[PDB]
Amino acid sequence: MEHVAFGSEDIENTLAKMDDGQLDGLAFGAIQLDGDGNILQYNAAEGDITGRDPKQVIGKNFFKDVAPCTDSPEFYGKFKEGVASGNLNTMFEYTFDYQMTPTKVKVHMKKALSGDSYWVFVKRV
């Protein structure tokens, strides 16, 4: 395991040092998105929660292609306000239900350290 707690205040500093292999050792799901919502990184824990194959979803658009249930003011709307303003730090519960058993999760979205990149962190609740 790579020990990092979900919700930690300096999580973007800690994860800036990790390659794809180290991201797969986290205890929670982690997705890195660019400012248009395309998936740059997607770890093994996220694939275990959602059933998606991490290697196949890289390069797809999260809001248009992979996760249409997040195309809503409650999720995508918060993301796009964050990208526009250049700052984002929000945590909320949500249900993922597209082509899968509905699964309740806690989501934490936070701007990365790398300029136009954004994290989505996910844990079961």
Ligand X SMILES: *C(=O)/C=C/c1ccc(O)cc1
Can you give the binding site for ligand X, defined by CB under 6 A? 31, 46, 50, 52, 66-70, 96, 98
Q: How far is the CB of 1 from ligand X (least distance, A)?
A: 20
Q: How far is the CB of 103 from ligand X (least distance, A)?
A: 9
Q: How far is the CB of 109 from ligand X (least distance, A)?
A: 12
Q: Which is nearer to ligand X, 42 or 86 (CB)?
A: 42
* DSSP states along 37-60: -BEEEE-HHHHHHH---HHHHTTS
Residue number with the smallest Cβ distance to ligand X:
69
Q: How far is the CB of 54 from ligand X (least distance, A)?
A: 9
Q: Which is nearer to ligand X, 25 or 60 (CB)?
A: 60
**E strand or H helix at 120, and its extent?**
strand 117-124
Residue 87 to residue 119: CA distance in whole angstroms: 12
Across 4-88, the runs of DSSP E, i.e. the strands, are: 29-34, 39-42
Q: What is the CA radius of gyration of the chain?
A: 13
Backbone phi, psi, residue 111, to 5°? -65, 140
Residue 114 to residue 12: CA distance in whole angstroms: 9
Q: Which is nearer to ligand X, 40 or 69 (CB)?
A: 69
Q: Which is nearer to ligand X, 13 or 91 (CB)?
A: 91
